[PDB]
Design a protein around this nucleic acid. Structure first.
Lengths: 53, 121, 54, 133, 226, 292, 237, 26
RNA sequence: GCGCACCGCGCGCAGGGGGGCCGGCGCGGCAUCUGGGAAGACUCCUAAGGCGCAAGGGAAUACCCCGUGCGCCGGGGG
């Protein structure tokens, strides 16, 4: 649920040994847009965990 | 409630958590609900324990579906703290999955253990 | 015989990827930030750290 | 010899062995409230009107296969009937569930299975309503 | 064996771990005035009794088994008052007990500490085992999770103000806890406190001298001021 | 030829009380290879041999009316519930199997639960209360259950076999009390009363040298009658103690049954000497009697 | 190419390196759960070379115990175009769709399921096909849908229950004709997990037999399943 | 390890389908 | 039961139905005993040192060997 929406870059990265995408559809929520910097990928992780829950 | 494969505290829970700890020492252990879900969906899982001490149990009710689809045995122990330090995590592990390989005495213990889980379900 | 040999070769591919993913998980244990159990050393001994992750 | 048998067509009564009388209804929402009525065996104007006599009481006896329905219509004072349950003989009930084809010229020479399927919509989809999503 | 014994605080009795398990464990109680067996204290588990403690009144025991079951046994009735479980213990290794103004029907001692194979020491107020009906699933007053290896020593200061616990599988694996507040002191020990692999500890009779003996055979002593 | 089960019709006018014996040929005999038998009152008797069938027995017809059976394996024990009815029947495979005695029919109703270890063979049962069960095991454990939920209450585990040879304490007989405690007559000669509120032991009376195969209590909770794999029975009185032990019998004693009504409070024992032998309850009163 | 099978309404499609058991599609152009299927037109249209009418859903012995029995070598399946089948344990209506493809437009399948979610997919499939009825009830309570099911010819039984012979027992004592078809899938690990499977199968046959069926044949589904049996029997005759 | 996991996913799907077709052929 | 001696038994063989249920083999339990593995953290944890990853050099070139950068534990002292 973090990587929903970014599967082309994601399987490109996983099949090509590169950097996987930090977020997918999630980026246009009201929170990971509120954060900036490394807080973007970090709150993308924890928002995705709480949102699976 | 929804914990119809409830493991009994007379030492079946204890053999479950002990085999959790030994699989944790053989690195055959996927810990937590998300990584458990990845192991079941990828089909690596040989057995899976959940915790019925979950404060909303709906957040682990989703994996008995895909365990029924992949036909792997699941069973609930009544304490996520006992599962958590059974893993050796220092947090509460809510649902654990434990895989196997080609040749290990651990794989034999998984076999006898889900024989007992099959005696439950 | 043809689908038999394709069963045989496909099982060999999947067991190769399974042993490879198992080797990489063992090297996550052997290359860990603190002492974890898992894997064999080159002596033949296995790494069993009896600690807990505090 | 009164009975009370309920197929998907309607109600019936076979006091004279051979088919004697019926109680028909079709194509409504009160038609599935028939099943809501026999959900415990509550009041039903087709049931009590089928069991309504006028002269006196001299035989008050009747056979329903399930005792919930039988003692449920024991309490009903619209007839003063107090029936008993059918004593586990499925010769009659089985023989008339395979003898519905000579029952339908009495009441409905038609295909009631379409509104039976609609009753399955307002029964199974009533259970999808019973899990309200 | 005779190795795993305890003697009651009133000095009247002395329990020995009977060295036979097959899925349980019993304590044989000795009258030391005669040195004669008078009573037996079987609990059920896998590998028997881990570690037990006399009630401070002397009127009964409390027994830490090896599955997470802890039995508050009674000497006067010679029967179990109640069995209750530790919070999530796999094995359970050691056990101490002590304090004042506790349950006089449970011996009058306030705090109990129970240590496990996972290095976690659970500390329970024994006033919160009463709801004699013992709470089958109580909550620790504090989980102590600082040490990572199997807790091997546990002790209270006999005025009921300190809890020193530790392990003998790491070097400075000795921690020290204020009671009733349940806080680990952070300034002692340091990197440079010579402890060694701590095999035994002991508080003095006035709770003012601590003794630590290690895996190589050297006692060291620390005065405590307060 | 040998006795394997005794049961009285009632245990409390011309009320027809009868005595039901099971003779090791397969026979059943009633006074004024089968393995177990009970009555039911609210009165009909149920028996098992070594096979999985649990069968009723009509008496005025003297023919095996209403056989029952199942999937699992060899029934080694069964018993009927008290009132605030069903049967509970424990087997070799670790199942305990509930049979329904709805008004006249003996049905294979339900298997509630089962031990995880297949090497736990149940041996006997007794009912601590209405809805909760005490079962002995082939290991050292005796174990409680609830049949409202089927659940598995506290394992009441005995020790090891100290006296030599084997490890496992095979618990041959389990009975209960009106006080609320339960006697377990184990192997290795010992008996032990376990407490009932907390399900732990309270006294371990060592009397016999070889395994107590059967025992039975008084109907007032006063006298306990054990009988062992020796030639030996022994009585117990109030927490407890024994009074004496006389070799009434000649082989091992295999089955007790007590009765405390009609001014005739007797306990009847039978074993493998082919000779049923009756005792009073007032054991200091007078002598005994035997019947073949 | 497609030739008929020995059974009534069952088809077999022989290809170059393989063969595929298949039924006739009742609602054409639509796969139920995403399966391969076969289109062909009636002859006279070699100039057309366009398949419009005839359609054959390919039927999977790994997703269907009944296809595992038909490829398992079953004598009769009791179901034919025109039959009335009482399906027990109908998860998502997949094998209910293949049975509905066998009994066809004039037949009737009476699908029973306990779960609401498979109830919903069953109402999707059973809204597409008009010979299947959806019944979402407990199979242990046949007097709930006694107003819904008439006397059927066949009962198919696929429930994972320990009281399977009792459930099918009372369902046949209410809904199955004099001399009725019964076709039960049995999972020995589901009835008794600590017993050998031949003994579990024989004991379930004996429970049907004292439940007054008559076992005709038994086959074990074992190139396609493990420890599964398919028992074909007939009620009261 | 991410690459090995994705290749094992694809190969596991291929073995499920190809084994299913194999037992369909025999 | 046919062919072989219509001056004979028995034989070459087709195989029905049950038997002696003799032994092997297969599967299921088996209180113990025996062996192996796992194994308790007091135990065993190869030593005052070892292990891992990545580079470098040499080969019996499948294996193996030697001592640079990063880390992980340990002994001693404290």
């Amino acid at each position: 649920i973090q990587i929903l929406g970014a599967e082309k870059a994601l399987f490109r990265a996983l099949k090509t040994k590169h950097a996987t995408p930090k977020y997918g559809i999630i980026y246009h929520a009201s929170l990971v847009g509120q954060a900036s910097g490394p807080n973007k990928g970090k709150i993308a992780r924890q928002l995705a965990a709480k949102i699976a829950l | 409630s929804a914990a119809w494969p409830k493991a009994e505290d007379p030492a079946l829970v204890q053999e479950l958590l002990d085999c959790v700890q030994q699989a944790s020492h053989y690195r055959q252990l996927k810990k937590g609900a998300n990584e458990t879900t990845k192991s079941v969906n990828r089909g690596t899982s040989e057995l899976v324990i959940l915790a019925a001490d979950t404060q909303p149990l709906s957040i682990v009710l989703h994996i008995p579906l895909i365990c029924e689809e992949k036909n792997v045995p699941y069973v609930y122990v009544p304490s996520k703290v006992a599962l958590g330090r059974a893993c050796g995590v220092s947090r509460a592990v809510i649902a654990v999955s434990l895989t196997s390989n080609e040749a290990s005495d651990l794989n034999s213990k998984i076999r006898a253990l889900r024989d007992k889980v099959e005696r439950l379900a | 015989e043809k689908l038999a040999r394709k069963v045989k070769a496909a099982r060999k591919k999947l067991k190769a990827l399974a042993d490879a993913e198992y080797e990489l998980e063992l090297q996550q244990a052997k290359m860990a930030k603190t002492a974890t159990s898992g894997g064999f050393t080159k002596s033949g001994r296995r790494i069993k750290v009896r600690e807990r992750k505090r | 010899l009164f009975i009370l048998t309920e197929t998907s067509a309607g109600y019936a009564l076979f006091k004279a062995i051979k088919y004697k009388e019926f109680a028909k209804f079709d194509s409504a929402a009160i038609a599935v409230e028939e099943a809501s009525g026999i959900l415990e065996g509550k009041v039903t104007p087709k049931l009590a009107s089928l069991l309504n006599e006028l002269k006196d009481e001299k035989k008050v006896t009747l056979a329903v296969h399930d005792t919930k329905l039988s003692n449920s219509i024991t309490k009903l004072p619209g007839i003063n009937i107090k029936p008993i349950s059918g004593s586990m003989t499925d010769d009659l009930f089985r023989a008339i569930r395979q003898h519905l084809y000579n029952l339908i010229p009495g009441m409905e020479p038609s295909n009631f299975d379409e509104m039976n399927l609609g009753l399955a919509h307002s029964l199974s989809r009533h259970k999808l309503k019973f899990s309200p999503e | 064996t005779m190795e795993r014994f305890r003697v009651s605080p009133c000095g009247r009795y002395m329990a020995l771990v009977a060295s036979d398990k097959k899925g349980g464990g019993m304590l044989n109680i000795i009258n030391v005035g005669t040195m004669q067996w008078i009573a037996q204290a079987r609990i059920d588990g896998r590998h028997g009794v881990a570690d037990f403690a006399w009630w401070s009144d002397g009127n009964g025991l409390t027994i830490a088994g090896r599955d997470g079951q802890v039995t508050e046994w009674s000497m006067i009735t010679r029967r179990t008052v109640g069995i209750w479980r530790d919070e999530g213990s796999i094995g359970g290794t050691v056990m101490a007990l002590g304090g004042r103004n506790g349950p006089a029907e449970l011996g009058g001692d306030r705090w109990v500490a129970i240590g496990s194979n996972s290095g976690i020491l659970n500390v329970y107020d024994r006033n919160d085992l009463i709801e004699i009906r013992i709470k089958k699933y109580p909550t620790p007053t504090r989980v102590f999770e600082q040490l990572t290896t199997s807790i091997s020593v546990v002790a209270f200061s006999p005025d009921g103000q300190l809890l020193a616990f530790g392990s003998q599988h790491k070097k400075d694996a000795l921690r020290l806890v204020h009671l009733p507040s349940c806080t680990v002191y952070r300034n002692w020990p340091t990197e440079q406190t010579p402890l060694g692999r701590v095999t035994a500890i002991a508080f003095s009779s006035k709770s003012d001298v601590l003794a630590v003996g290690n895996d190589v055979g050297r006692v060291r002593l620390w005065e405590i001021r307060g | 030829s040998a006795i394997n089960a005794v049961a009285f019709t009632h245990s409390a006018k011309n009320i027809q009380v009868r005595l039901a014996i099971g003779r090791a040929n397969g026979d059943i005999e009633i006074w004024n290879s089968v393995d177990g038998l009970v009555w039911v009152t609210d009165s009909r008797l149920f028996s098992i041999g070594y096979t999985t069938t649990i069968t009723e027995w009509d008496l005025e017809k003297a023919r095996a009316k209403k056989h029952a059976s199942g999937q699992h394996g060899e029934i080694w024990c069964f018993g009927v519930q008290p009132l605030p009815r069903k049967l509970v029947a424990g087997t070799v495979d670790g199942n305990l199997v509930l049979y329904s005695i709805e008004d006249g029919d003996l049905k294979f109703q339900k298997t509630l639960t089962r031990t995880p270890s297949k090497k736990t063979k149940f041996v006997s049962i007794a009912f601590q209360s209405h809805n909760i069960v005490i079962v002995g095991c082939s290991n050292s454990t005796i174990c409680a259950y609830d049949v409202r939920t089927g659940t598995m209450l506290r394992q009441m585990t005995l020790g090891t076999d100290l006296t030599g040879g084997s490890k496992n304490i095979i618990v041959w007989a389990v009975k209960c009390l009106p006080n609320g405690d339960i006697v377990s007559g184990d192997s290795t000669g010992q008996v032990c009363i376990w407490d009932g509120k907390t399900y732990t032991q309270a006294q371990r009376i060592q009397s016999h040298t070889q395994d107590v195969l059967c025992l039975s209590v008084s109907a007032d909770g006063s006298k306990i009658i054990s009988g062992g794999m020796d030639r030996r029975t022994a009585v117990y009185e109030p927490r407890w103690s024994k009074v004496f032990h006389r070799r009434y019998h000649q082989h091992d004693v295999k089955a007790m049954a007590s009765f405390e009504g009609k001014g005739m409070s007797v306990v009847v024992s039978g074993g493998s000497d082919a000779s049923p032998i009756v005792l009073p309850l007032r054991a200091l009163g007078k002598e005994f009697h035997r019947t073949l | 190419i497609v030739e008929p099978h020995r059974h009534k309404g069952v088809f077999v499609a022989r290809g170059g390196k393989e063969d595929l058991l298949c039924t006739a599609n009742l609602v054409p152009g639509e796969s139920v759960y995403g399966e391969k299927r076969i289109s062909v037109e009636t002859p006279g249209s070699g100039p057309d070379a366009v398949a419009t009418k005839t359609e054959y859903r390919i039927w999977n012995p790994f997703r269907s115990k009944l296809a595992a029995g038909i490829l398992g070598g079953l004598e009769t399946i009791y179901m034919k175009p025109g039959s009335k089948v009482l399906y027990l344990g109908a998860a998502s209506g997949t094998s209910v769709s293949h049975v509905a493809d066998i009994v066809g437009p004039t037949g009737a399948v009476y699908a029973v399921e306990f779960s609401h979610r498979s109830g919903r997919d069953l109402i999707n499939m059973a809204t597409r096909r008009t010979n299947v009825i959806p019944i979402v009830e407990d199979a242990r309570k046949p007097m709930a849908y006694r107003m819904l099911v008439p006397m059927v010819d066949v009962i198919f039984a696929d429930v994972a229950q320990p009281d399977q012979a009792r459930i099918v027992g009372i369902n046949a004592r209410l809904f199955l004709k004099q001399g009725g078809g019964l076709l039960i899938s049995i999972k020995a690990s589901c009835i008794d997990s600590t017993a050998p499977p031949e003994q579990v199968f024989a004991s379930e046959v004996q429970k049907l037999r004292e439940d007054k069926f008559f076992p005709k044949e038994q086959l074990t589904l074992e190139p396609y399943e493990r420890d599964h049996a398919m028992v074909s029997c007939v009620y009261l005759q | 390890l991410g690459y090995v996991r994705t290749m094992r996913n694809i190969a596991a799907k291929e073995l499920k389908e190809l084994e299913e077709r194999y037992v369909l052929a025999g």
